Amino acid sequence: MLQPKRTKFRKMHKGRNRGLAQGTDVSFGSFGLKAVGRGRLTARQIEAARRAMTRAVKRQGKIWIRVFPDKPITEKPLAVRMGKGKGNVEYWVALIQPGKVLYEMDGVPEELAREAFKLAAAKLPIKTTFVTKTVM
Amino acid sequence: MIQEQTMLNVADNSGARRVMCIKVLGGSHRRYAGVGDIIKITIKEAIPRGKVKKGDVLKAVVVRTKKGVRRPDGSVIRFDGNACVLLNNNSEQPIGTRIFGPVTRELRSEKFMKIISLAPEV
Amino acid sequence: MIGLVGKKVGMTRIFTEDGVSIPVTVIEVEANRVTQVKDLANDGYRAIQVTTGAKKANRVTKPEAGHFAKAGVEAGRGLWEFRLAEGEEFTVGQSISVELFADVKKVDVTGTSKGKGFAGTVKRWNFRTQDATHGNSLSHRVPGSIGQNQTPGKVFKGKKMAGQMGNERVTVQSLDVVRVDAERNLLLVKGAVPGATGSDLIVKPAVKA
Amino acid sequence: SRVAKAPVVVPAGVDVKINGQVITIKGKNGELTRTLNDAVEVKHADNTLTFGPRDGYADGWAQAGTARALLNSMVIGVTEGFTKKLQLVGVGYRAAVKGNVINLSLGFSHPVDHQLPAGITAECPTQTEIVLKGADKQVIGQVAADLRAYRRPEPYKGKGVRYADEVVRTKEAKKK
Amino acid sequence: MKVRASVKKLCRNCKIVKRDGVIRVICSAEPKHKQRQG
Amino acid sequence: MKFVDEASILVVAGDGGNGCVSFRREKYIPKGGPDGGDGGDGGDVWMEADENLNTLIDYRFEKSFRAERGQNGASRDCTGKRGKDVTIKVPVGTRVIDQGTGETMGDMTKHGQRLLVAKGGWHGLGNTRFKSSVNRTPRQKTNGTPGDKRELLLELMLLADVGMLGMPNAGKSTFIRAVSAAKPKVADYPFTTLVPSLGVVRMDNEKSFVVADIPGLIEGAAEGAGLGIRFLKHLERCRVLLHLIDIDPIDGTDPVENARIIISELEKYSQDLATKPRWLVFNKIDLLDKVEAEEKAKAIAEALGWEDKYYLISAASGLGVKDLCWDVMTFIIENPVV
RNA sequence: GAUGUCGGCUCAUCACAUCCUGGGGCUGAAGUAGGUCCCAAGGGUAUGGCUGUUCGCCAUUUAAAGUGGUACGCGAGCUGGGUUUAGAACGUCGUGAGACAGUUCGGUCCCUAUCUGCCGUGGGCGCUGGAGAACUGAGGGGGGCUGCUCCUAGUACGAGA
RNA sequence: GUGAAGAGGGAAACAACCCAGACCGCCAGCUAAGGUCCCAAAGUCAUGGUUAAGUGGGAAACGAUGUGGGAAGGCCCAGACAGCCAGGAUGUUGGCUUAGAAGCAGCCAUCAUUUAAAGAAAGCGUAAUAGCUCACUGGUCGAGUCGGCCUGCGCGGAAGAU
């Protein structure tokens, strides 16, 4: 359900997923979740992972969301001829490049964070990895 | 022979007078029933004061066959009119108390002694 | 042990002591004579060639006449080969009787069935005859469809349609023998055997249990 | 590999001969012959047996250890012998030994007859007890497995044939 | 026994073995941990 | 097997079929119309009353019973098949209470009775059922109504003909040994049995009766703090209530007070059990080797103040077991009201 | 530039994501009977009322009355039952002619097989002198279904059922 | 850029893919892509490795003591790990609640004694006593063992109809 309340424009182009990621350095926590491959991250996956992490950590520690969809996706309804204008928006996704940090954890031990990220990787449609905070 | 959709009489005093053979039991793709067999019948007309009514469906046992019965010595037992004995659905027990008409000896072979015992003929 | 070769003259029922009728087939068997004996050294397999009946001298030509004279056997109606049982041995020229079937109690009969000529699809493969009414036109005993659409694009081998029936070897297995006569040379086998009256029949011991 | 690093020593009264890749450990408890893999070499030496691989083979010591274990089994089989223990639990379970023939009755509709190998002997000191004597562990193990497969016990009542040292699972099941 | 793509040691007494080129798990404690399709 | 009540089962009614939005196109008719078959009716869960069954051990594991999903409506006006009915075997005498606003839907009366617990979901109508002048190309789909997810509690009433009540010191469990062969736990410690068990005394093929042993209670079990008085509920259906008094108990050493203490909780459970014609017999007679056995048994009879016919039986082996069974089944014959 | 469409009859073939039969594993598998999963396509896999119906509901059997492909198999094999050219009527729209993925009645289904394909039967030649017979078998083809009862045994199991 | 409007060679066949733009003839040689086991012309060429799956010669999330290489870490002959032989209580059935809570149905503190070691304590079982383990320690054995990362090549995941 993570979706901007107001948008300047209703529709967006298809776009591309070239280049490298920007948010690769951890700046809010100690243990971070980083993507390994390109893909599309729907909002539903985001709140599913957030709920899974809340269930795994027994509601202790702090949770940071480093990604927001900010991009709509249009799907044509069934049995509709091509054209006749662009379709309406159904769900919003976030485009990320490899190396983008997804989630960052604090107040958790190493093994708990590792098992939580292992559980999260299943809901993630792309390969993830475990990283830790490094000075500067 | 006896097959489905066959007009059949009664050999017992249960209360029915004419019964309709519409299904023959014994196995898949069962075509005909011999002299001793289990068949499914429907009542077409019966005495209003009899033990059975109109439209009831129950199991019956053949007693006489128009075509005949093949004896081991090349003998055929023809009959004039085909009848059956009314039996309960859950248990193979005769409903009528008496049997009117000839009965073949083959019914004894397949362990049907109730009809044989109370039969005033063969 | 080997079987015999005989001719069918008819079939008749047999009355038992309890009154049960047993329809059996009457086959006359002539005293067969061994014409050749085969071995591993020469032909690579063991078998014996026998003949039955008699044939007219004028009809018998020089090749088979010399073949018979080599074995010291007179003319015969035909020649047949029987395989041995890995230990049974036969000599050339000895006669074969019929009482040896007093213990097999189960025989196999092979012969040429009655020729029905060119038979239709309904008679050959026991097909289902189409409706003769309800608008049907010129299609009653026709086979009908013989394949699918252009995707296979051909008719598969072994498809069932009209052909020539009979006049071929037919084997009937597990036939019970009732009585055998030595002085009259008759064999009584329960059941029906293929072929017509007077046709040559080959009787062999049952191979199954 | 590391298991083969300890040479095995045959006891007295046992003769060992080598005819290539065939080994014989015949002696007091019978004669047996086993073929090798054509890859591990045994060297004639003092009263001990050593094992070594051939250069150019990936397995080498991995199968040399297997060969060492097999020779260790066969030497004690031909010097001390191999004993297998089997017992019957449950009513209607009868067993006996007559010569080289054993009969089993496990509630079947017909007696069960099993044929023992030449170098395997069986005895029945107790009516519900069968002891197997042999010179090779593999043969007696196969015989015991064949006997067990007929009436493998269930975890409800434990009825069937079983080994002495084995343990079965007991389940408290109640339904239907 | 269960056949599934993912095979893991459910308990401490689950031994991973390779039989006939496939991954199998044998549990000496109790046979509910038997898996295939490794 | 053993008689255990309070069985819980959860059942879901079959979900209705799902319609499909399809249009018919033929060789010469590009505009055929909406051609989508309706879904199939969801499966309906059923139950049967079984005279033979007398226990709920088959529902102790809280098995989930699933009714098959109604076949989804296929194209070209193909209606999906309705789901097959699911039937659960239920004994006679059970009442069912739901979880949350629970109520008794029905009580078992006779074998073969059918009761509806959850009705299957309705089928999903296709596009063929909503065409009109206003809309000629229906693209909407109607999902089938979901099935009824309900929790069922199965409670079973004891069907035994003879009920047993006595202190754990009495050989109530070993009394089954002399009268039948059921093999419950028998030992020299109090509260040997934790659940009531069943048993049948078939002395003759024509006539037999069912006797059940019930775990004993303690002096304080009336108020609670032990097993409670909940096992007294498995009564009021047995024709006779057999009672055993343990003569000269090793740990009791007070036959006068423990004989009358049985009636204390008996008179205060719910209605004193309507004062059913209970009997009074003794046990452990083989312990007393000679004439000394019966005068003290007669002496304790006057303490109760009942003065009716009494039996001297030893549960170890025989000694009045054979003829007491005849007297028990005799009382069964004259009274056919259960 | 054309009968060619759906369903039904006859004829079947192939795949297993297996309905039964067959071999098992686990089980919240006492037994019979059940749930799940694996291998296995050799065989078999219903009769009637309603509707044209494929699909379905109902009644009664069986081990089941499997899922799909083959121009949603097969109309130069059959049927014309649905829709449907020309007629007419009902309800709606349009002043109207007329129309209606709204409903009812009736309403032409051709072809003598050229080739490949298949089923059977023949002529020539060859197999190295010719001819008459009898056989081995490289290969190919046909079938591979099971219900019930009894003995085991009312035995094991099971408190009894 | 190609075809349209370009022939030929290769991709098994395959306008649009790669090389290559055919004036004609020659029984001459040298090359591009692609190949040199044969069909079908050319290395069964040389050097050093990987692969056991026919991967080559179609496929993903995930799983796995498959295997090779690399940088590292803990324990290591003041004897490294796994096996084997033994020990593994003392107040103390800890208190309460409890028919039965003696460690392993419920809560609590969880400190404290002689030891190379013993926790009112994790698992099996007994209603509970029993009876088996575990943590831990001793001795023999004797040289690598344990678990984290990257990378190449491998396996399962992988079932359709002539």
Ligand SMILES: Nc1nc2c(ncn2[C@@H]2O[C@H](COP(=O)(O)OP(=O)(O)NP(=O)(O)O)[C@@H](O)[C@H]2O)c(=O)[nH]1
């Ligand atoms: N010699 C003898 N000993 C008896 C006799 N009846 C009982 N006992 C002994 O007394 C014990 C009584 O215990 P038990 O029968 O188990 O009691 P229970 O019927 O199980 N009662 P609960 O289930 O309430 O514990 C028996 O186990 C047995 O040792 C008897 O007739 N003779």
Ligand SMILES: [Mg+2]
């Ligand atoms: Mg008791």
Ligand SMILES: [Zn+2]
């Ligand atoms: Zn395990």
